[PDB]
Design an enzyme around this catalytic site. Structure first.
Site, PDB file in Angstrom:
ATOM      1  N   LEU A  43       0.823  -1.201   0.000  1.00 37.06           N
ATOM      2  CA  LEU A  43       0.000   0.000   0.000  1.00 37.06           C
ATOM      3  C   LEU A  43       0.863   1.259   0.000  1.00 37.06           C
ATOM      4  CD1 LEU A  43      -2.959  -0.975   2.445  1.00 37.06           C
ATOM      5  CD2 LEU A  43      -2.871  -1.174  -0.082  1.00 37.06           C
ATOM      6  N   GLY A  44       2.023   1.202   0.647  1.00 33.38           N
ATOM      7  CA  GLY A  44       2.926   2.344   0.716  1.00 33.38           C
ATOM      8  C   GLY A  44       4.140   2.091   1.574  1.00 33.38           C
ATOM      9  N   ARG A  45       5.004   3.095   1.648  1.00 37.47           N
ATOM     10  CA  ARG A  45       6.229   3.059   2.425  1.00 37.47           C
ATOM     11  C   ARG A  45       6.509   4.457   2.935  1.00 37.47           C
ATOM     12  NH1 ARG A  45      10.934  -0.101  -0.483  1.00 37.47           N
ATOM     13  NH2 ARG A  45      11.259   1.857  -1.616  1.00 37.47           N
ATOM     14  N   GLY A  46       6.728   4.559   4.236  1.00 37.66           N
ATOM     15  CA  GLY A  46       7.060   5.810   4.903  1.00 37.66           C
ATOM     16  C   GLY A  46       8.520   5.788   5.275  1.00 37.66           C
ATOM     17  N   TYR A  48       9.535   5.216   8.438  1.00 40.67           N
ATOM     18  CA  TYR A  48       9.674   4.265   9.536  1.00 40.67           C
ATOM     19  C   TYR A  48       9.071   2.885   9.271  1.00 40.67           C
ATOM     20  CZ  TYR A  48      11.388   8.207  12.355  1.00 40.67           C
ATOM     21  OH  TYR A  48      12.133   9.257  12.842  1.00 40.67           O
ATOM     22  N   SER A  49       8.295   2.720   8.179  1.00 39.11           N
ATOM     23  CA  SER A  49       7.662   1.435   7.882  1.00 39.11           C
ATOM     24  C   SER A  49       7.206   1.226   6.440  1.00 39.11           C
ATOM     25  CB  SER A  49       6.453   1.240   8.796  1.00 39.11           C
ATOM     26  OG  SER A  49       5.413   2.152   8.486  1.00 39.11           O
ATOM     27  N   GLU A  50       6.913  -0.039   6.099  1.00 39.75           N
ATOM     28  CA  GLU A  50       6.338  -0.399   4.802  1.00 39.75           C
ATOM     29  C   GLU A  50       4.942  -0.959   5.131  1.00 39.75           C
ATOM     30  OE1 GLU A  50       8.784  -2.998   2.187  1.00 39.75           O
ATOM     31  OE2 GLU A  50       8.309  -1.575   0.574  1.00 39.75           O
ATOM     32  N   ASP A 154       0.449  14.320  15.255  1.00 37.35           N
ATOM     33  CA  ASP A 154       0.506  14.222  13.789  1.00 37.35           C
ATOM     34  C   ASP A 154      -0.894  14.215  13.159  1.00 37.35           C
ATOM     35  OD1 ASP A 154       2.009  14.204  11.364  1.00 37.35           O
ATOM     36  OD2 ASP A 154       2.306  12.023  11.411  1.00 37.35           O
TER      37      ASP A 154
HETATM   38  N1  LIG Z   1      -5.759   0.601   8.842  1.00 42.41           N
HETATM   39  C1  LIG Z   1      -5.643   0.894   7.540  1.00 42.41           C
HETATM   40  N2  LIG Z   1      -6.608   0.457   6.687  1.00 42.41           N
HETATM   41  C2  LIG Z   1      -6.470   0.705   5.378  1.00 42.41           C
HETATM   42  N3  LIG Z   1      -5.482   1.350   4.749  1.00 42.41           N
HETATM   43  C3  LIG Z   1      -4.555   1.794   5.620  1.00 42.41           C
HETATM   44  C4  LIG Z   1      -4.558   1.613   6.992  1.00 42.41           C
HETATM   45  N4  LIG Z   1      -3.436   2.192   7.567  1.00 42.41           N
HETATM   46  C5  LIG Z   1      -2.797   2.711   6.546  1.00 42.41           C
HETATM   47  N5  LIG Z   1      -3.416   2.512   5.339  1.00 42.41           N
HETATM   48  C6  LIG Z   1      -2.985   2.996   4.031  1.00 42.41           C
HETATM   49  O1  LIG Z   1      -1.685   2.520   3.766  1.00 42.41           O
HETATM   50  C7  LIG Z   1      -1.089   3.379   2.767  1.00 42.41           C
HETATM   51  C8  LIG Z   1       0.374   3.585   3.072  1.00 42.41           C
HETATM   52  O2  LIG Z   1       0.537   4.194   4.369  1.00 42.41           O
HETATM   53  P1  LIG Z   1       1.409   5.549   4.528  1.00 42.41           P
HETATM   54  O3  LIG Z   1       1.495   6.063   5.917  1.00 42.41           O
HETATM   55  O4  LIG Z   1       2.811   5.306   3.958  1.00 42.41           O
HETATM   56  O5  LIG Z   1       0.689   6.610   3.580  1.00 42.41           O
HETATM   57  P2  LIG Z   1       0.353   8.167   3.627  1.00 42.41           P
HETATM   58  O6  LIG Z   1      -0.672   8.462   4.653  1.00 42.41           O
HETATM   59  O7  LIG Z   1      -0.135   8.569   2.237  1.00 42.41           O
HETATM   60  O8  LIG Z   1       1.699   8.952   3.964  1.00 42.41           O
HETATM   61  P3  LIG Z   1       2.021  10.414   4.511  1.00 42.41           P
HETATM   62  O9  LIG Z   1       1.934  10.350   6.044  1.00 42.41           O
HETATM   63  O10 LIG Z   1       3.377  10.843   4.017  1.00 42.41           O
HETATM   64  O11 LIG Z   1       0.923  11.315   4.007  1.00 42.41           O
HETATM   65  C9  LIG Z   1      -1.968   4.633   2.680  1.00 42.41           C
HETATM   66  O12 LIG Z   1      -2.739   4.611   1.487  1.00 42.41           O
HETATM   67  C10 LIG Z   1      -2.869   4.511   3.914  1.00 42.41           C
HETATM   68  O13 LIG Z   1      -4.141   5.126   3.741  1.00 42.41           O
END
Ligand SMILES: Nc1ncnc2c1ncn2[C@@H]1O[C@H](COP(=O)(O)OP(=O)(O)OP(=O)(O)O)[C@@H](O)[C@H]1O
Ligand SMILES: Clc1cc2[nH]cc(Cc3ccc[nH]3)c2cc1Br
EC number: 2.7.11.1
Length: 327
Positions: A43-46, A48-50, A154
């Site tokens: 779904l993504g990578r920050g 601190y985590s994937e 945050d």
């Molecule tokens: N509990 C969850 N249920 C569904 N999707 C989730 C959940 N937690 C995280 N995600 C999704 O996982 C993806 C990756 O997480 P990530 O924190 O890297 O993304 P982000 O919110 O777009 O980053 P950023 O904080 O830089 O804006 C995102 O699309 C996020 O909405």
């Protein structure tokens, strides 16, 4: 030097709870079975985590797996302890399990899955009623975690998930969250730029739960005025200047004087002199449908330099802005 500060609410929560509650280092993690989870897609990578979408094969339900990068164990234990402490609270993301990832050999946090509505779609289409409804749902999550002695640090659109079909909201990403301890000096390098409170921008370390109310105010201002982000700084310094062009420099100088803050001299050449702009100055034909005198009054009480003068989450819930919301 700087004058101390303490929260006007929930100041004693962590002292009247046992040490096991906030002393996250002493916490012994109960490890689940990693094979209960099959990864489906990234779904993504920050930083601190994937983040992976996964299936819990024991009940065939969707989950989200957050595999932590091997940065610093202190941060890891703090996030786990906060998630466990807040579990079952209103609109708090549920930590379903903690496993040791077989590949990374680091902890992997398993969360409930939210079939969330696209954030651009939420921004572009939530109605006046929906903004009020969902803001009230965010305040339930914030009052809960603040009442539990925790600040999120945050609060921003990407950390507030909405499944619009089921009118379901979840406050996620507790990796920057911290236990509030009166008199404690905290790291100011928290929150995303556009959501940083003036306390962070002026380097005032003795902040509290009220930081989350500023971030919430930034979300609200962006939504109702149709301006993303509302305070659009090029960097952390310009971020304070953007705020000052709205709230004025006189109240900023009073804030600095009150807390005996030594303002970074970098600010002398860029802050300039500004007077507060009345909230009606931001109203136009494209945002008029989201603005009301109650929305303006509410926003005004969140976006204040003085962290001690902002509405708390509980006081915010009593505001006329929410009278129309079905309870
Ligand atoms: N509990 C969850 N249920 C569904 N999707 C989730 C959940 N937690 C995280 N995600 C999704 O996982 C993806 C990756 O997480 P990530 O924190 O890297 O993304 P982000 O919110 O777009 O980053 P950023 O904080 O830089 O804006 C995102 O699309 C996020 O909405
Ligand atoms: C409650 C929660 C939300 N999460 C994400 C958004 C979109 C957004 C807010 C500001 C810019 N974009 C949102 C809106 C409201 Br009202």
């Amino acid at each position: 030097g700087p004058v101390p500060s303490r929260a006007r609410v929930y100041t004693d929560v962590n002292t009247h709870r046992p040490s096991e509650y906030w002393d996250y280092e002493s916490h012994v993690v109960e490890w689940g079975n990693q094979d209960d989870y099959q990864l489906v897609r990234k779904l993504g990578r920050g930083k601190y985590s994937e983040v992976f979408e996964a299936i819990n094969i024991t009940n065939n339900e969707k989950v989200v797996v957050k595999i932590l990068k091997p940065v610093a164990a202190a941060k890891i234990k703090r996030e786990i302890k906060i998630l466990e402490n807040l579990r079952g609270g209103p609109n708090i993301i549920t930590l379903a399990d903690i496993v040791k990832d077989p590949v990374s050999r680091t902890p992997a946090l398993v969360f409930e899955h939210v079939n969330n509505t696209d954030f651009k779609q939420l921004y572009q289409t939530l109605t006046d009623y929906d903004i009020r409804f969902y803001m009230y749902e965010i305040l339930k999550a914030l009052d809960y975690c603040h009442s539990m002695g925790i600040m999120h640090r945050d609060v921003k659109p990407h950390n507030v998930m909405i499944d619009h079909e089921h009118r379901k909201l979840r406050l996620i990403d507790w990796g920057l969250a911290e236990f509030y301890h009166p008199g404690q000096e905290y790291n100011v390098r928290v929150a995303s730029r556009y959501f940083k409170g003036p306390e962070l921008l002026v380097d005032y370390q003795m902040y509290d739960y009220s930081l989350d109310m500023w971030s919430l105010g930034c979300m609200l201002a962006s939504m109702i005025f149709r301006k993303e982000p509302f305070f659009h700084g090029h960097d952390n310094y310009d971020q304070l200047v953007r705020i000052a062009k709205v709230l004025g420099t006189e109240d900023l100088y009073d804030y600095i004087d009150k807390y005996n803050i030594e303002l970074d001299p970098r600010f002398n050449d860029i802050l300039g002199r500004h007077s507060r702009k009345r909230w009606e100055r931001f109203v136009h034909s494209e945002n008029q449908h989201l603005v009301s005198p109650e929305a303006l009054d509410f926003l005004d009480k969140l976006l204040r330099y003085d962290h001690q003068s902002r509405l708390t989450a509980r006081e915010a819930m009593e505001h006329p802005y929410f009278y129309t919301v079905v309870k």
